[PDB]
Subunit: 428 residues, 3 copies
């Protein structure tokens, strides 16, 4: 499949993004439990108590049993509101997080994908370089069988041949481990991916750094949270201060209670005291409570809440310094990426001709084998460097998008285009 | 000492593994505090209170003093149990952790040990390459003193000589800092370690990836915790639900209370009210409590508990995707490791011969010094690469063991064998 | 500006160090809230309750309203003290942290600064090496226009020229991103910084490792906290044990309460019961409470507190093994740094001569272009390696100071001296 398909297969199964989802869901569901306390609280009670006096109470025993139905209602309790508010701001922050986590699934899938591609290039270029050092090998031998070149010419091309093999060895191990990477992110294994279409490839000067910086300054998901979080630090200052406000609660209830006495001092005296009482009651009331002074606590708290607010602020600064540095760097790099794709595109030609000469010359005694084998090594580097440069350019784009905090499923389509030629991921 | 000894000296002192032990110990000891609440709670109270009426109560004062001995016992409180259970599942997870931390002391000690070894190799091979570029140096000089070679031949071998020195310099600094590494992990310094016995060295094709994967899928300590932890998430769902259940506690007590009145309204009225009371009481009772409705709280909690359960699940998927990627990579690498040890074992020969030629040729004006100094550099790389490949093979074995979650003191013995020749760790 | 100025401009704005400050401030301000509970707790209450009997209580209703002014005072409550103490020890640890965070602003600013310097060197040395491969290029062309050199001589110098360009490209991108680094730490952009004065440069053998180790063993901020934190672990053991001690609190209050009855059974009976009661009361008292047995809880806790104390101990060991490894490494590195500055200072000469030969020879057909272009590449490496070695030496000094835990604004001045020549940070 291609980038845009491999992505979607992951967006519906990546355990990391889902875990992040479930974390946002809990965060919001919690807003309920937060408001919960502002609502009616109904409970049922019932007791049974056997008493037994033993001094002036001697000879007096009793069996009472009650069962009330109590209800509570907050009339004015600032902290109970504060809490609800804060749980909401928290869910909000958790959301900005989930979004950030969504962007990461993109950058990481795209990167993982172009690693399996660059992995393939390295292998192919290593097989081309091997096949070359082989022709050159086979040839120094013929030229040596007619005494037109020392034995060293054959011993040299053999040595550099064995060496390329040790590489082709690992270059193939990497294409493998690069697919295990993709597998883990997307959850799948791919027989083939759509390779970068080198003909239709074109770089594109990036927006001026200034425009980039200014949108990121208003969209970068990281900066956004430092903002939300600073707000939350302020909201908490208020919370601390509520410790000074008074509260008004309402209570209501209806209960029955049946008591029965027994014992010495019960048999006689009468006085209608020890008669079995069977009470019934209905109640409603208001409770006002106001802190007057609590050992300095409420202020020590309000101060702390403010220092923590300063901290939240310093972190906002950091977030911003970071969103800046990330933007300028991403700008610099994408440019240097385009600039490098050119230099190497070039070097791959100057090295191709030079190799063609050395080879041609070697065949008529004008060029040394060392010159050939070195021209060969030079070409197959410029070749990989160029291949590599292209992938970094593609990624650097995604980086700027992410630094702006606007990296999405679309940016992943714009790239799904420069892809085309279906190549195998298996090193057969 | 050797690997198997250096390990044991660390297993009894590594501050990280011990810190992890103490963490498992606390975790289990806590299971007590968790059950604690399900047992009898006995306390002693005693008060003294001076009252002083001031309205209809004016002229009525009192001095009362009490002292009860209370006891509480949970009869049916689901959450109290739930708690115990959860504290147990927690200790369990903490155990799986400790085990994981035990494996790491192995892998890290073995690795730290083979780094001091590979560090030694780099130093030796750098000293051999220096001693070579010296002979070749001393020689281009004699050949130059008989005008058989330009001055450049001596200036070239000198330059490349100074360069090897700049290396031998750092290669020796690394053998040092490589020993500081081992020191930190084992707590000791070693004058010498058992070096890899290159003659008896043999690679061993690893188990099919499929078998590997399947055992890891049932032993990998990481995958194990994702399982334990997912269970815990479920256990917590139940816990949330317990908020709906009612509870039944039993209370018992025996207390005395002596009150004495005094004042205006006390001098006369009598009525046997203001007579000094000296009460005695014994009580036992049951208390039933049942939530009827708590502002939606209990469900908002049960929902949250479930979302968190989803998260626990997604992480189990991550654990698994990881155990897979780790097994398959470890398999790939160990193979590539064996495959590489061969290629380099080979290249060390093809490069040995080619160097012997260049040298032989240079001595009879047939080969250039550049050709000699380059053949020299080529040999002493293939030599190190091979040396290095062997160590990685050894480690890659330990890795697969770790991915399976069965890496133990034995696997550290199997390797203690390919060791032998006691080499110094000091670069004299 | 120079290092010592760039530093001060950051020390008054670095959002990370400020955030750390605010964290230490809260930590100390909290010591109040910790002591808070040991002081008088004054509150105001007032209720209103309408009762309505409905069985034996039928026909009896009431309207009562109260309003007390309560005060509480801890007489002897160990845990309330313990808490204050612990909050103090915590602020203490938070302080050692802030200090550590202060050192880091130094090391990081110095490093960010010397990276912008080494970044400049790499660019300059790459421009010198480019200007060289250009002269040599232009020359092989003239030598080629007189059939005195094959076409390959011009094709070779061209290829290696394009290659240096691909580098000069990135070396300039790095000087940029190296300035973004400084910007983020200091908050500023610098047109120019004081470059290392290469003439007045001299290395200085570091104190013996033993003296270094012994001071660090008594000043290293990291080892210090492991100590503070181990103490705190002990303090928490005591805290656990306080769960066995009894507590003595004092209460005091003055409240009024006005009750008024009404209803069927109220109209008549009289008996002076249903008359409106208007009570007044003043109270003071002592409350003694002593745990007798709490399901094993208090011990399960004291045990845990001890296992955690073992952990705190193991970590102290880790801290120490680390302070050791850090000192020894810094010692080793600064030495190897001095030793390396020498080897490269040397190699820059042996490579300078050899290049001068090759060039001289090439001009009279005695030396090959490949020999020239390689002597050129060899020189402009030893040159950078030397430049680089110097910077590492400077840093390694700062590292040892830090390992001792005495790195300060002064050490940043001693270095501000080896600086001088104002160089631009812009790659014009
Ligand atoms: Cl207060
Ligand atoms: Cl509910
Ligand atoms: Cl106990
Ligand atoms: Na694979």
């Amino acid at each position: 499949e291609n980038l845009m398909q491999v992505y979607q297969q992951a967006r519906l199964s990546n355990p990391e993004l889902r875990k992040s989802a479930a974390d946002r869901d809990a965060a919001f569901e919690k807003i309920n439990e937060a408001r919960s306390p502002l609502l009616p609280q109904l409970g049922l009670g019932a007791d049974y108590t056997y008493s037994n006096g033993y001094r002036d109470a001697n000879g007096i025993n009793s069996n009472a049993t009650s069962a009330s139905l109590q209800l509570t209602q907050s009339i004015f309790d600032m902290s109970k509101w504060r809490a609800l508010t804060l749980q909401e701001k928290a869910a909000g922050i958790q959301d900005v997080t989930y979004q950030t986590d969504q962007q990461t699934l993109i950058l990481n899938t795209a990167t993982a994908y172009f690693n399996v591609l660059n992995a393939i290039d390295v292998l192919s270029y290593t097989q081309a370089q091997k096949e070359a050092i082989y022709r050159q090998l086979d040839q120094t031998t013929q030229r040596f069988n007619v005494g037109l070149v020392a034995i060293t010419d054959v011993q040299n091309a053999r040595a550099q041949y064995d060496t390329v093999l040790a590489n082709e060895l690992t270059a193939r191990n990497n294409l493998d481990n690069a697919v295990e990477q993709l597998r883990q992110i997307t959850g799948n294994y791919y027989p083939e991916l759509a390779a970068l279409n080198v003909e239709n490839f074109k770089t594109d000067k990036p927006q001026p750094v200034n425009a980039l910086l200014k949108e990121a300054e208003k969209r970068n998901l990281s900066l956004l949270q430092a903002r939300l979080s600073q707000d939350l630090a302020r909201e908490q200052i208020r919370q601390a201060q509520d410790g000074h406000l008074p509260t008004l609660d309402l209570t209501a209830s209806t209960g029955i209670s049946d008591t029965s006495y027994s014992g010495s001092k019960t048999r006689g005296a009468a006085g209608t005291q020890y008669d079995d009482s069977n009470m019934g009651q209905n109640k409603v009331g208001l409770s006002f409570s106001l802190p007057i002074y609590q050992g300095g606590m409420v202020n020590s708290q309000v101060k702390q809440a403010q220092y923590n607010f300063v901290g939240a602020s310093e972190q906002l600064e950091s977030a911003h310094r970071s969103v800046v540095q990330t933007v300028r760097s991403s700008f610099n790099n994408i440019n240097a990426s385009i600039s490098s794709i050119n230099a190497y595109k070039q070097a791959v030609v100057s090295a191709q001709s030079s190799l063609d000469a050395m080879e041609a010359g070697y065949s008529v005694g004008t060029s040394t084998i060392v010159d050939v084998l070195d021209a060969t090594t030079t070409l197959y580097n410029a070749k990989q460097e160029l291949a590599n440069a292209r992938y970094n350019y593609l990624i650097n784009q995604l980086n700027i998008k992410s630094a702006l905090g606007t990296l999405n499923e679309q940016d992943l389509l714009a790239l799904n285009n420069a892809l085309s030629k279906p190549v195998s991921t298996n090193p057969e």
